[PDB]
């Protein structure tokens, strides 16, 4: 599995379960094409987004829809979502984990690449 | 000054000087309109982005063009940029500082609201 | 002012006001000597910790007592405090801002050096 | 496995492999007793630190010796180490993952509790 997303909740100290994640790929157009999407599991992880055949060199944007999540825990947040834009597979295919740590007024994101 | 952006470099432990910052506002269209832009100063700060007259309730996206910055320090980074999407002035006008801490494979962003 | 500490609250999106901060310096003993302390102001900042005469090369530990702060906002946190250990003035005297961003189950710390 | 530590490198976008981790527990003395220690594996993870029998309610400090790690990648860092102090098992036994994301001038730490 070449691209996985993991999301953590800094407020409850737990995985963020059932969070919506959308992945876009920048086309030759200079437009964002919808690439893949899904919701995180009980472990805060989302696997099965894509296959190594489909996941080519390019510029990707990962959007994590965090505002719904925060409402659903009784919280009126501030961000519309968390977004991460990165270039992928530039050096040949890699395994990428894009991880996000969420708080109402802040977030951190990191890529772990193997 | 109702909206200011501050950018820090986690690699050199210093302000990120002369970084490009673009602000967009979501229009009734559901399109991003260009709202304001500029480059950070020697202190890593960008003031004068807007006036309190122009800075109304709405959804804003702040894009920090970090890839140029990292190249200019001799570094091939991973993100195309850092992006922060948030709703503003929902509760009446506030002063917003959107701060970003940059590393090649990671970033953190926070809003400080007064 | 050669050493300043700034503390932000990721939960309320605001400065952390009236937070206790203790600074220790490692002695020849290999013991921590109490070096300086104080509480953050309404801006989340603590200035006047030391003078450039007193702030010599050495290993320092900055401890931010965050648990009291979180209780005082109605919150039972997880960390006893945030701690940052660093070597100072190794390359000649600098101005150091040690900044901390707090959440109940997480924190980030950075040094900005001039 | 009730306590595990994971360490990530924000500079290389990878796990931090073979990093030293020491765990201390605050005794009735108000002294830190050495509780457990080990080095992270190729995945940046350290398991087998303790057993659920030994891991009781108390105040723990996790110290990650990051300075050696940064030297070993050709880097003169700033922190002596990363330290996390927290209260454990206060509400009955939990599984705790203490995760740390490292950069030369910054770090973030979070607890994920199950
Ligand atoms: C995500 C993040 C975390 C920490 C910092 C940060 O270190 C910082 C430092 C400052 O001197 C300062 O004035 C502010 N601010 O006003 O927000 C932030 C900046 C961004
Ligand atoms: C402070 C911080 C922020 C983000 C990460 C982080 O990126 C991360 C990545 C993982 O694959 C993973 O399994 C976990 N975890 O279990 O906690 C954390 C780690 C630490």
Residue numbers in the entry:
A (entry chain A), B (entry chain A), C (entry chain A), D (entry chain A): 10 to 123
Publication text:
Transthyretin (TTR) is a homotetrameric protein produced mainly in the liver and in the brain's choroid plexus, and circulates in plasma and cerebrospinal fluid. TTR is composed of four identical 127 amino-acid residue β-sheet-rich subunits, termed A, B, C and D11. The TTR tetramer is formed by association of the AB and CD dimers. The weaker dimer–dimer interface defines two, largely unoccupied (<1% T4 bound), funnel-shaped T4-binding sites.
We also obtained a co-crystal structure of tolcapone and V122I-TTR at 1.9 Å resolution. This is of particular relevance as the V122I mutation impacts directly the weaker dimer–dimer interface, resulting in an increased rate of tetramer dissociation. As for the WT-TTR co-crystal, the twofold symmetry axis along the hormone-binding pocket creates two binding modes of tolcapone related by a 180° rotation. The conformation of tolcapone in the T4-binding site and the contacts it establishes with the mutant V122I protein are virtually identical to those found when it is bound to WT-TTR, explaining why tolcapone is also a high-affinity binder and a more effective aggregation inhibitor of the kinetically unstable, FAC-associated, V122I-TTR than tafamidis. According to model 1, tolcapone shows identical binding affinity for both V122I-TTR T4-binding sites, with a Kd=56 nM. The binding of tolcapone to V122I-TTR is entirely enthalpically driven with Δh=−11.5 kcal mol−1 for each independent binding site and an unfavourable binding entropy TΔs=1.6 kcal mol−1. Indeed, V122 is located on the periphery of the H β-strand, which forms an antiparallel β-sheet with another monomer, stabilizing the AC/BD dimer interface. The V122I mutation impacts directly on the stability of this interface and tolcapone compensates this destabilizing effect by bridging the H β-strands of adjacent monomers through specific hydrogen bonds and ionic interactions.
